[PDB]
Amino acid sequence: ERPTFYRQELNKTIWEVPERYQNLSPVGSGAYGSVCAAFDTKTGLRVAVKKLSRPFQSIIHAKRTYRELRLLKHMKHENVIGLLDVFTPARSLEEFNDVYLVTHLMGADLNNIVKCQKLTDDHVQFLIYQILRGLKYIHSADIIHRDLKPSNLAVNEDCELKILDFGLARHTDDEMTGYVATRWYRAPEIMLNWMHYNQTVDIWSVGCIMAELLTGRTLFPGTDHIDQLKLILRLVGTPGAELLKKISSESARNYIQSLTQMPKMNFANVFIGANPLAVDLLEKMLVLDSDKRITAAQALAHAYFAQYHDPDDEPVADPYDQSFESRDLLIDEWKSLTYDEVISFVPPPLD
Ligand SMILES: O=C(Nc1ccc(Cl)c(COc2cccnc2)c1)C1=CC(F)C[C@@H](N2CCOCC2)C1
């Protein structure tokens, strides 16, 4: 009933995997887990196999593992990463210490593509169309990516795009400091802790990515947070009273009122020679007030995507029960939760 498992030490971590996974080759590790490329002999797919580093070490660890499983079990979209397989070598709940996730192997991101390929406006259209299509799906289930960047967008040779999160790491304070790609794509409200954030933080990141595809250059390469806010605000303008009032942090509100007031720039003179439709969409994405930002759903109807848009083939997600996000549980409760879900996984119909 249970497939047979086999052992292999790679980089002094033990991998126990069903025999159907062959030719395991390490691709990356990080505090939260290690990844291998593999060949699934049962489907003829090349796969990535993520083994979670100490999945139930803390409460906050055990919850995180439960969170990633649920997410990845829910996501079934062309432009979003799907789960091909999840497994444990544990034979019971008492043995359960280890969690392995299987997806389609990605190889080449948008950061590979913007660095090493001349992109036409049609290429930018197709790329941004697919992110927006994926985000419409992610957002309709109330899931927020929070970390959209070119290194989290997976792109094949026909320019076809999947949203994932490659992040194997902790997301600390220093990793966000300095001249770092980990902070260039973030919405200003979440970068600076301005207010309680929402879905539209993802849209900010899309406008950041999109700019970069049009110019082949980072839109906001801040040497630090404050220097990144000065960049942002130079492009889009210092806020007025209406937005100032919405920033819950009085301390941070006091800082943006220190700044010499600036008008929103002429985007057609920042983005010299762009499709005026690309320009227009950028101005409706890169809006400081997240209440005023265009949504994915509204963006898929923008004239800039007329060649791709089909309102009959841009689906929403199924209802996602996220009520667990507001419960306190013990490790063994998260672990058992995770376990039901492992033991319950039913494969994609081999498409
Ligand atoms: O992609 C995820 N996890 C994941 C889960 C399993 C694996 Cl194997 C991977 C890595 O895939 C690779 C690795 C190396 C080379 N090619 C492909 C990643 C995500 C985890 C999340 F918790 C969230 C998530 N994301 C949420 C927002 O919408 C998009 C999906 C994606």
CA–CA separation, 183 vs 286, rounded Å? Answer: 16
Residue 50 assigned ligand-binding role: yes
Count CB-CB contacts under 10 A for residue 107: 13
Ligand 1 geometric centre to CA of 210 (Å): 21
Minimal-distance CA residue to ligand 1 atom 19:
165
Closest CA to 143 of 314, 317, 335: 317
Q: 165 an active-site residue?
A: yes
Ligand 1 geometric centre to CA of 91 (Å): 26
Closest CA to 89 of 194, 1, 15, 149: 15
Q: State the angle between helix axes of 121-140 and 201-215 in degrees (0 to 180), rounded to the nearest 10.
A: 170
Contact 284, 293 (CB under 8 A): yes
Residue 32 assigned ligand-binding role: yes
Counting from 1 in the atom list of ligand 1, the atom nearest the Cα of 75 is 30
Out of 81, 149, 153, 202, give the residue to mutate to test ligand 1, the one with the largest number of ligand atoms within 8 Å of its CB. Answer: 81
Topology classification of domain 15-107: Phosphorylase Kinase; domain 1 (3.30.200)
Residue 35 assigned ligand-binding role: yes
Out of 36, 53, 72, 345, give the residue to mutate to test ligand 1, the one with the largest number of ligand atoms within 8 Å of its CB. Answer: 72
Contact 182, 175 (CB under 8 A): yes
CA–CA separation, 282 vs 254, rounded Å? Answer: 28
Paired tokens of 52: 């979670």
Q: CA dist 90 to 9, 18, 47, 94, Å?
A: 18, 12, 22, 8
CA–CA separation, 22 vs 44, rounded Å? Answer: 11
Paired tokens of 337: 């939760």
Contact 279, 210 (CB under 8 A): no
Residue 31 assigned ligand-binding role: yes
Q: Domain locations in the chain?
A: 15-107, 108-316
Resolution in angstrom units: 2.5
Minimal-distance CA residue to ligand 1 atom 26:
145
323 contacts: CB under 8 Å, gap ≥ 6: none
Counting from 1 in the atom list of ligand 1, the atom nearest the Cα of 27 is 14
Evaluated on CA atoms 116, 121, 122, 128, the torsion sign reads positive
Among the listed residues 165, 224, 280, 332, the single catalytic one is: 165
CA–CA separation, 314 vs 297, rounded Å? Answer: 9
Paired tokens of 178: 């300095």
CA–CA separation, 312 vs 38, rounded Å? Answer: 36
CA–CA separation, 23 vs 3, rounded Å? Answer: 18
Ligand 1 pocket by Cβ (under 6 Å):
27, 35, 48-50, 68, 71-72, 75, 80-81, 101, 103, 105-106, 138, 143, 145, 163-166
Closest CA to 67 of 338, 343, 346: 338
CA–CA separation, 26 vs 37, rounded Å? Answer: 6
Ligand 1 geometric centre to CA of 81 (Å): 6
Residue 25 assigned ligand-binding role: no
- What is the C-alpha R_g of the chain? 22
Counting from 1 in the atom list of ligand 1, the atom nearest the Cα of 104 is 17
SS3 track for the chain: CCCCEEEEEECCEEEEEECCEEEEEEEEEECCEEEEEEEECCCCEEEEEEEECCCCCCHHHHHHHHHHHHHHHHCCCCCECCCCEEECCCCCCCCCCCCEEEEECCCCEHHHHHHHCCCCHHHHHHHHHHHHHHHHHHHHCCCCCCCCCHHHEEECCCCCEEECCCCCCCCCCHHHCCCCHHHHCCCHHHHCCCCCCCCCHHHHHHHHHHHHHHHCCCCCCCCCHHHHHHHHHHHHCCCCHHHHCCCCCHHHHHHHCCCCCCCCCCHHHHCCCCCHHHHHHHHHHCCCCCCCCCCHHHHCCCHHHCCCCCCCCCCCCCCCCCHHHHCCCCHHHHHHHHHHHHHHCCCCCCC
Minimal-distance CA residue to ligand 1 atom 27:
145
Out of 136, 165, 199, 201, give the residue to mutate to test ligand 1, the one with the largest number of ligand atoms within 8 Å of its CB. Answer: 165
Q: 108-316 has which CATH code?
A: 1.10.510.10
Measured torsion, CA atoms of residues 333, 61, 69, 300, in degrees rounded to the nearest 10: 130
Residue 167 assigned ligand-binding role: no
